[PDB]
Coordinates of N, CA and C and ligand atoms in Angstrom, one line a residue:
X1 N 8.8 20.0 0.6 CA 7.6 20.2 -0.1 C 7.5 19.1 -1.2
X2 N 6.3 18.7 -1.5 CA 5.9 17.1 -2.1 C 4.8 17.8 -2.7
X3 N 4.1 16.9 -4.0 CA 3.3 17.0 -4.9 C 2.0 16.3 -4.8
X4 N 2.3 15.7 -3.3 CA 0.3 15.1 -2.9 C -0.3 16.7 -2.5
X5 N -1.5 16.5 -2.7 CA -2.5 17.5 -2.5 C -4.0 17.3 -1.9
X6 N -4.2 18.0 -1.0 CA -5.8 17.4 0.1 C -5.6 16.1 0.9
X7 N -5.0 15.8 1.2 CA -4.6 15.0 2.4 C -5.1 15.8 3.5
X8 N -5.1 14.7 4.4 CA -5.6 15.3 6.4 C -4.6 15.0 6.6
X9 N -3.4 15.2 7.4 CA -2.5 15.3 8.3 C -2.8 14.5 9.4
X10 N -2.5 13.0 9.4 CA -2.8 12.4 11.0 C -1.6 12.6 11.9
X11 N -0.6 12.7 12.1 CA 0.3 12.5 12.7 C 1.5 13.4 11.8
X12 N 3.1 13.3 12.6 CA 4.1 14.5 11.5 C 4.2 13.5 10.7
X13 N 4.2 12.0 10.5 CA 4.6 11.5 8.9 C 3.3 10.9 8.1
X14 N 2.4 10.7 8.6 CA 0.7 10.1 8.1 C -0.1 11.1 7.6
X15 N -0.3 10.8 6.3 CA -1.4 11.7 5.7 C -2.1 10.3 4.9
X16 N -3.6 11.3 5.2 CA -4.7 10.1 4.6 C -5.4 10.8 3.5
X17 N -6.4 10.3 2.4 CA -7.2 11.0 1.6 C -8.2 9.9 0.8
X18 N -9.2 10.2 1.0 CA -9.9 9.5 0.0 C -9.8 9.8 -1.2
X19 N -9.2 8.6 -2.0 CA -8.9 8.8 -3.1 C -8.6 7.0 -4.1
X20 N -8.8 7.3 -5.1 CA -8.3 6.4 -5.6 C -6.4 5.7 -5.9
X21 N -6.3 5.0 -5.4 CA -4.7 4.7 -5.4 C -4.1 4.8 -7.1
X22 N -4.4 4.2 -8.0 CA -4.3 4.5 -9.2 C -4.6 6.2 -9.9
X23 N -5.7 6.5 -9.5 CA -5.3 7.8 -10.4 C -4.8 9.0 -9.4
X24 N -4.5 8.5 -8.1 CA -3.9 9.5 -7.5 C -2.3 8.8 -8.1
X25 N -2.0 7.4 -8.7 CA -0.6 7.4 -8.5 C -0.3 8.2 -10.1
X26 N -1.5 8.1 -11.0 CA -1.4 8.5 -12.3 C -0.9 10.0 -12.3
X27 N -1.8 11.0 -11.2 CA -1.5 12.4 -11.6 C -0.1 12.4 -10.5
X28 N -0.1 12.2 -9.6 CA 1.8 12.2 -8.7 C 3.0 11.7 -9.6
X29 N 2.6 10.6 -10.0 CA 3.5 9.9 -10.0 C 4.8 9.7 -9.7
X30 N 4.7 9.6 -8.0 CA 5.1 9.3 -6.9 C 6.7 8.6 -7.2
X31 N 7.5 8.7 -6.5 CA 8.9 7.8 -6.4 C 8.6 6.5 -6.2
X32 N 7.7 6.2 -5.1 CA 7.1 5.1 -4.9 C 5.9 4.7 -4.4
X33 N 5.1 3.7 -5.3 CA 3.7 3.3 -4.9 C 4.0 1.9 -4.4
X34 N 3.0 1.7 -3.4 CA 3.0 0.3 -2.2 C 1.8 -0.4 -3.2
X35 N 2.3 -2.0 -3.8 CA 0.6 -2.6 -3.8 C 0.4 -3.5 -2.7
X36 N -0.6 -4.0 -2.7 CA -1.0 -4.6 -1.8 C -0.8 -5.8 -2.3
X37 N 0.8 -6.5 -2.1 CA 0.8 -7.9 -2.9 C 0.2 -9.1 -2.2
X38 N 0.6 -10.6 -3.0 CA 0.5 -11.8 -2.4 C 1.9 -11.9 -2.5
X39 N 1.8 -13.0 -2.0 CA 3.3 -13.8 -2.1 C 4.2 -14.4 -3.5
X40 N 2.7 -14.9 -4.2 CA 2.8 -14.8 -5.6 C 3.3 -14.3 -6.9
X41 N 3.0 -12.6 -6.0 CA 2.7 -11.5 -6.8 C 1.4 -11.8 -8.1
X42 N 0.5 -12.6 -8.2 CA -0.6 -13.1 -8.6 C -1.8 -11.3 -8.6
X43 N -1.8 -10.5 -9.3 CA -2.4 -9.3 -9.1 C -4.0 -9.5 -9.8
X44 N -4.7 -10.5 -9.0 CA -5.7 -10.3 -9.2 C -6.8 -9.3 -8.9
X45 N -6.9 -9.0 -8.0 CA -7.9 -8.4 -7.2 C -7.5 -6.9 -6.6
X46 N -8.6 -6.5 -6.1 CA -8.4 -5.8 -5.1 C -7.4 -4.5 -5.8
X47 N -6.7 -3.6 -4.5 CA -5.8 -2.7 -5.2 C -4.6 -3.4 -6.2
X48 N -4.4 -4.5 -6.1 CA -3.3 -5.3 -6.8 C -3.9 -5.7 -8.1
X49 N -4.9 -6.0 -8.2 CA -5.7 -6.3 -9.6 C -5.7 -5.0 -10.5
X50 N -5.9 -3.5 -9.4 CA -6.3 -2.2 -10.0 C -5.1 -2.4 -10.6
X51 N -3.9 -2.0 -9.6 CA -2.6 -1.3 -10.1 C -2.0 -1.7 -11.6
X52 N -2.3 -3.5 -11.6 CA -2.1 -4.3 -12.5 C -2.7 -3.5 -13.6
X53 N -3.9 -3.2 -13.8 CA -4.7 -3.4 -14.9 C -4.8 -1.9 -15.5
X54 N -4.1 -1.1 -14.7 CA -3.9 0.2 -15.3 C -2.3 0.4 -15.8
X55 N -1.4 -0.6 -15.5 CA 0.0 -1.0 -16.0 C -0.2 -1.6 -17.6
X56 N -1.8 -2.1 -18.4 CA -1.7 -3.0 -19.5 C -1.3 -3.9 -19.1
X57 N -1.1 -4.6 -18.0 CA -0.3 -6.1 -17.7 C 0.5 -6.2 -17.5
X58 N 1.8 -4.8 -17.8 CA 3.2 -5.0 -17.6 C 3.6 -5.4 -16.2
X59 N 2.7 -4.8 -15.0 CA 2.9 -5.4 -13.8 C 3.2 -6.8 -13.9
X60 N 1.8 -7.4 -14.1 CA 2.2 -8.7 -14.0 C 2.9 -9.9 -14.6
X61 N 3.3 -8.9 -16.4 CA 4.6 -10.1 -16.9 C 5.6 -9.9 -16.1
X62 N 6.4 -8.5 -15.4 CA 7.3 -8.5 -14.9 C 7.4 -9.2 -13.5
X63 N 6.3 -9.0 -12.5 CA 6.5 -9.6 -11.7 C 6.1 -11.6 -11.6
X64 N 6.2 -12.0 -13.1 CA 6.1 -13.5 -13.0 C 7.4 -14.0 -13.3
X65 N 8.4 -12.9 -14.0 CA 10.1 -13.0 -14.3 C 10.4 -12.8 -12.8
X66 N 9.8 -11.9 -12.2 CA 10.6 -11.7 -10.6 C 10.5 -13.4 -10.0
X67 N 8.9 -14.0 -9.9 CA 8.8 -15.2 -9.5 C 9.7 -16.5 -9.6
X68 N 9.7 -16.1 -11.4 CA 10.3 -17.5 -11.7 C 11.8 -17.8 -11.2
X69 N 12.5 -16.0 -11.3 CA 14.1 -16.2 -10.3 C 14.1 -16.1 -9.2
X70 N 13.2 -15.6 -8.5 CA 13.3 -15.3 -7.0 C 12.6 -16.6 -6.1
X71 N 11.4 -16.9 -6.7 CA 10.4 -17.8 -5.9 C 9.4 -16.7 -5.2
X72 N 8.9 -17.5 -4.6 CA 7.4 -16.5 -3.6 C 8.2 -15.4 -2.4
X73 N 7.8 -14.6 -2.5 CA 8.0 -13.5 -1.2 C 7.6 -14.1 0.5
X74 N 7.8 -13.7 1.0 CA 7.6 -13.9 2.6 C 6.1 -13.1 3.0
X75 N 5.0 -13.6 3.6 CA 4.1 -12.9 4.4 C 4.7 -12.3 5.3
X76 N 4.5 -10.2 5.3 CA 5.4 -9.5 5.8 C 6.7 -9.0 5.0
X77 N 7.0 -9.6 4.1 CA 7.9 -9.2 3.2 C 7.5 -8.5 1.7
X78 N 8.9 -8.4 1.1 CA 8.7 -7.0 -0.1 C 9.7 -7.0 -1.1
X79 N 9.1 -6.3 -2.1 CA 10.2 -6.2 -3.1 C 9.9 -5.1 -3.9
X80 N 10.9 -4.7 -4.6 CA 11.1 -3.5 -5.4 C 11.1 -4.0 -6.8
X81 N 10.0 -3.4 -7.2 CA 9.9 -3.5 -9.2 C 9.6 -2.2 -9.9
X82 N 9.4 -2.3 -11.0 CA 9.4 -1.0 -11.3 C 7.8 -0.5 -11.2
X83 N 7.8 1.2 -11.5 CA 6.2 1.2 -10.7 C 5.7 1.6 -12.6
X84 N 6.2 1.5 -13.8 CA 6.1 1.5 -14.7 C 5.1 2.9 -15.2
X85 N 3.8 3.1 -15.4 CA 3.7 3.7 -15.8 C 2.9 5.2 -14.6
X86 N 3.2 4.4 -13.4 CA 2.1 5.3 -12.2 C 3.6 5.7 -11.2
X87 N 4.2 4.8 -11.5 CA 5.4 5.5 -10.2 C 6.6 5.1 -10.8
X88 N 7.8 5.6 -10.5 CA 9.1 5.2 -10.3 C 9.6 3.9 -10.0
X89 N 8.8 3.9 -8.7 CA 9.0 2.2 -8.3 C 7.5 1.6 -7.6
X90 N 7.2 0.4 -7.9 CA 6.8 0.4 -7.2 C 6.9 -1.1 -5.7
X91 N 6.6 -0.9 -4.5 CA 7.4 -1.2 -3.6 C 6.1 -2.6 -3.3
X92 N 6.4 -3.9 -3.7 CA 5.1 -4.5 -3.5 C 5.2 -5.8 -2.4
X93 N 4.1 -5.3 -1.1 CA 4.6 -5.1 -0.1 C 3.4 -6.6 0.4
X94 N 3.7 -7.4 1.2 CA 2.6 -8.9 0.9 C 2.1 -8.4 3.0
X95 N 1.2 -8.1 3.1 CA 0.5 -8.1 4.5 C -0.6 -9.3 4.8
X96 N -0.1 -9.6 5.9 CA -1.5 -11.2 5.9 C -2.6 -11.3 6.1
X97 N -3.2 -11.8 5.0 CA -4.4 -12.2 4.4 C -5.4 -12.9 5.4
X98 N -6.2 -12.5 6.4 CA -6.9 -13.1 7.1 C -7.7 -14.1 6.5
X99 N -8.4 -14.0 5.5 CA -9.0 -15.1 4.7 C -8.4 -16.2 4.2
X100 N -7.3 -16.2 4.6 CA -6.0 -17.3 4.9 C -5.7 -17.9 5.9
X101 N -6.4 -17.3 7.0 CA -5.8 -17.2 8.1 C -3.8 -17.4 8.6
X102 N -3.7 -15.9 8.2 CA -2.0 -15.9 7.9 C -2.6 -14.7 9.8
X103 N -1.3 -14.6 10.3 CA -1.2 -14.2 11.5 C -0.7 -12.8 11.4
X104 N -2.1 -12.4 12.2 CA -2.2 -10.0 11.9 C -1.2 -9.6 12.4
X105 N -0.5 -10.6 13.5 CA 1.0 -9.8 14.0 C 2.2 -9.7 13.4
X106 N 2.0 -10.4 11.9 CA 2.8 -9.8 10.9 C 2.7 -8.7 10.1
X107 N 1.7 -8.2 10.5 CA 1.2 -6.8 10.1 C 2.5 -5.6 10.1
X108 N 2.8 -5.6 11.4 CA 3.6 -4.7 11.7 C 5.3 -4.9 11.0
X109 N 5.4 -6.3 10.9 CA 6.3 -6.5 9.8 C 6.0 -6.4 8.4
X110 N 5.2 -6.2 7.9 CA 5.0 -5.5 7.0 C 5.0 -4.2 6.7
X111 N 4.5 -3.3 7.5 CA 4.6 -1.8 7.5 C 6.0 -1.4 7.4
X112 N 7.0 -2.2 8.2 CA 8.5 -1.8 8.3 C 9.2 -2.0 7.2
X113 N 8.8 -2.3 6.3 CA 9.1 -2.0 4.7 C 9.3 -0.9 4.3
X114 N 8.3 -0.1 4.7 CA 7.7 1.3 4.2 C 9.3 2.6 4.7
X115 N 10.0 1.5 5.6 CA 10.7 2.7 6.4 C 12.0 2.7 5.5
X116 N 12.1 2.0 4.5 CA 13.1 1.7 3.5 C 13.0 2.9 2.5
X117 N 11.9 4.0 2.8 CA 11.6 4.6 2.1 C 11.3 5.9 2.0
X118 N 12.0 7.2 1.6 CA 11.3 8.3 2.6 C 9.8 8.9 2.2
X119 N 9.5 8.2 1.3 CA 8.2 8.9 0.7 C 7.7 8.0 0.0
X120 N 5.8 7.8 0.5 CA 5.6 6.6 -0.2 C 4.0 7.2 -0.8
X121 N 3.1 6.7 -1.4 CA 2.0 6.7 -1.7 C 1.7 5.2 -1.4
X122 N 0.3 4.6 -0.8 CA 0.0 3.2 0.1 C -1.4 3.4 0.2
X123 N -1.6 2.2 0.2 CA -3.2 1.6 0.7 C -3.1 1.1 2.5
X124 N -4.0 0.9 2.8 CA -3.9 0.4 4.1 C -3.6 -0.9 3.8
X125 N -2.6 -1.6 4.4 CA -2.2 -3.3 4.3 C -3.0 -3.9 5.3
X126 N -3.6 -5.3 4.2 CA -3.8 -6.2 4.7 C -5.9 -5.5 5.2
X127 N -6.1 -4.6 4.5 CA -7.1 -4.2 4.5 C -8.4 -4.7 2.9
X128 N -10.1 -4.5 2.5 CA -10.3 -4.6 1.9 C -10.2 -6.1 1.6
X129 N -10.0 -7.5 0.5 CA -10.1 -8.2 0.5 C -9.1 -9.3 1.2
X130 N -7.7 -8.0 2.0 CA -7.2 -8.9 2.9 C -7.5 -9.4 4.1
X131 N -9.1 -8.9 4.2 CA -9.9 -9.1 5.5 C -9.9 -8.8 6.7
X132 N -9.0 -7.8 7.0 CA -8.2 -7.5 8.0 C -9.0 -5.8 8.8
X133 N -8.8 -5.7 9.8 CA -9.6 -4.5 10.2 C -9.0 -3.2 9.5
X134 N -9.8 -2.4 8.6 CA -8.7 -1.0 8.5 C -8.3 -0.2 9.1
X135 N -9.2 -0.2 10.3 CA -9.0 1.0 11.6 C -8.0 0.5 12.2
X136 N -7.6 -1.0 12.7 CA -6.1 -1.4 13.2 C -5.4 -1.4 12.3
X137 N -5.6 -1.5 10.9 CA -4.0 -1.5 10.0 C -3.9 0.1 10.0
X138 N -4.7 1.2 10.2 CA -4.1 2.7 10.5 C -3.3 2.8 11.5
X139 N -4.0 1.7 12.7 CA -3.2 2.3 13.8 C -1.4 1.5 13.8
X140 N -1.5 0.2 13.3 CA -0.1 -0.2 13.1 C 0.7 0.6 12.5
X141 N -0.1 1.2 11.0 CA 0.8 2.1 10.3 C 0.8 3.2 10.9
X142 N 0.2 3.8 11.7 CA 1.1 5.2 12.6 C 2.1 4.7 13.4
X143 N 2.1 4.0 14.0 CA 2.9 3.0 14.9 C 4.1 2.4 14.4
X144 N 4.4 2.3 13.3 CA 5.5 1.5 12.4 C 6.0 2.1 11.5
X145 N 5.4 3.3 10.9 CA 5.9 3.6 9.8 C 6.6 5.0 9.9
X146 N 7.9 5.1 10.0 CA 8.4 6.7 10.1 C 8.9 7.7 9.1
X147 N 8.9 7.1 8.2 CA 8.9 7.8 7.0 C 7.8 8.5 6.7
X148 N 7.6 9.3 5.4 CA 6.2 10.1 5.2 C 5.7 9.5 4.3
X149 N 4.3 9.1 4.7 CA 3.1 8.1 3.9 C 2.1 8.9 3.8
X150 N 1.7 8.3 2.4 CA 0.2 9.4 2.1 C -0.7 8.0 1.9
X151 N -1.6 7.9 2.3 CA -2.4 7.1 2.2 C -3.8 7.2 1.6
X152 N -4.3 6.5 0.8 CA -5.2 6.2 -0.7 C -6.4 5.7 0.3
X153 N -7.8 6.1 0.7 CA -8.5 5.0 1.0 C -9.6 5.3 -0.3
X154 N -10.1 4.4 -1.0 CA -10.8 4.3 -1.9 C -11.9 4.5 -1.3
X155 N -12.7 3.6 -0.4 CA -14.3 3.7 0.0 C -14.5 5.0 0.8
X156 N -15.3 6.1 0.5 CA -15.6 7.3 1.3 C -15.8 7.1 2.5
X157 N -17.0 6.0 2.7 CA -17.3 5.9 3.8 C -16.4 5.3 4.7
X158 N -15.5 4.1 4.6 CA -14.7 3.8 5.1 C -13.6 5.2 5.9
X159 N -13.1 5.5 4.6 CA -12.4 7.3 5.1 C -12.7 8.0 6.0
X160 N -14.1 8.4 6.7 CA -14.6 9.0 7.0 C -14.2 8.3 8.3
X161 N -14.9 6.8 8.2 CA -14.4 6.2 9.5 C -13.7 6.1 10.0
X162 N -12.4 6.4 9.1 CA -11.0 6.0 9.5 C -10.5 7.2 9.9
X163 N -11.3 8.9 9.5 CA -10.6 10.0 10.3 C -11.3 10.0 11.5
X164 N -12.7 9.9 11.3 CA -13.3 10.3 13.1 C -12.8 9.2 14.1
X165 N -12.6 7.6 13.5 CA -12.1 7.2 14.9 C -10.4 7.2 15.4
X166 N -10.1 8.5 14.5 CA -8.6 8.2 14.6 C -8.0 9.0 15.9
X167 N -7.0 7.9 16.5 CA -7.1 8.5 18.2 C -5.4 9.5 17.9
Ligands
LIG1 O1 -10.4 2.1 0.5 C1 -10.3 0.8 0.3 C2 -9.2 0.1 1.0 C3 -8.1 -0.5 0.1 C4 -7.7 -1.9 0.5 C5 -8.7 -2.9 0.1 C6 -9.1 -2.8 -1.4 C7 -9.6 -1.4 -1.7 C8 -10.9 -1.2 -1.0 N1 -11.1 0.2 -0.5 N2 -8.6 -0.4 -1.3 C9 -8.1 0.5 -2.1 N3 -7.4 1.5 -1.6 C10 -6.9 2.5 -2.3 N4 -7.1 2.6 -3.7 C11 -7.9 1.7 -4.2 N5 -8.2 1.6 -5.5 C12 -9.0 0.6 -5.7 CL1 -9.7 0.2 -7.3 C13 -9.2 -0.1 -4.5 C14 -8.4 0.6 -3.5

């Protein structure tokens, strides 16, 4: 028993909810929350700008210390920082950026991140300003992800879409 609440049940480890990823990670405050990084870790935008901006910034001094020793992350690749003031950790996770044209069949390497993990709170990867379809990044992430995920979609209408066409 877990402390997410109103979720739909897609599958035994996928639950979805429209909701906002920030204040759903504010009232959980989850073991771990997924952002939706760059390679950079550059948290401008999108859920990575939110997460950022409800941290005061600490997201992103910390993750420019991760940069300067580590270098850029891998498209598909991940790392563990702290999730400061919304989670425990948070797991920030880089899926490719169609507006990049970076290649969607790293998609699924990206999801396999998530399995490092038994419990996650997540956005759809590589969804939203990663340009990428949301309805295929649900279906990779039932497909790849075996651990238990709760998933944040912000836009209603999107949600909506993403339960009726879910096969
Ligand atoms: O539902 C979506 C899809 C998903 C990936 C793309 C960016 C946005 C757009 N809307 N996003 C979010 N997901 C969950 N929580 C969120 N909070 C804020 Cl702000 C945005 C956001």
């Amino acid at each position: 028993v877990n402390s997410f609440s109103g979720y739909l049940k897609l599958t035994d480890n996928v639950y979805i909810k429209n909701a906002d990823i920030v204040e759903e990670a504010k009232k959980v405050k989850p073991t771990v929350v997924v952002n939706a990084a760059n390679v950079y870790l550059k948290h401008g935008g999108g859920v990575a700008g939110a997460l950022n901006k409800a941290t005061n910034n600490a997201m992103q001094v910390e993750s420019d210390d991760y940069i300067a020793t580590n270098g850029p992350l891998k498209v598909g690749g991940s790392c563990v920082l702290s999730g400061h003031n919304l989670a425990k950790h948070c797991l920030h996770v880089v899926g490719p950026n169609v507006n990049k044209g970076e290649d969607i069949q790293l998609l699924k390497s990206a999801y396999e991140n998530f399995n490092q993990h038994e419990v996650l709170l997540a956005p759809l990867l590589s969804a939203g300003i990663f340009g990428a379809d949301p309805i295929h990044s649900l279906r990779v992430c039932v497909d790849t992800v075996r651990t238990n995920v709760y998933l944040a979609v912000f836009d209603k209408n999107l949600y909506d879409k993403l339960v009726s066409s879910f096969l």
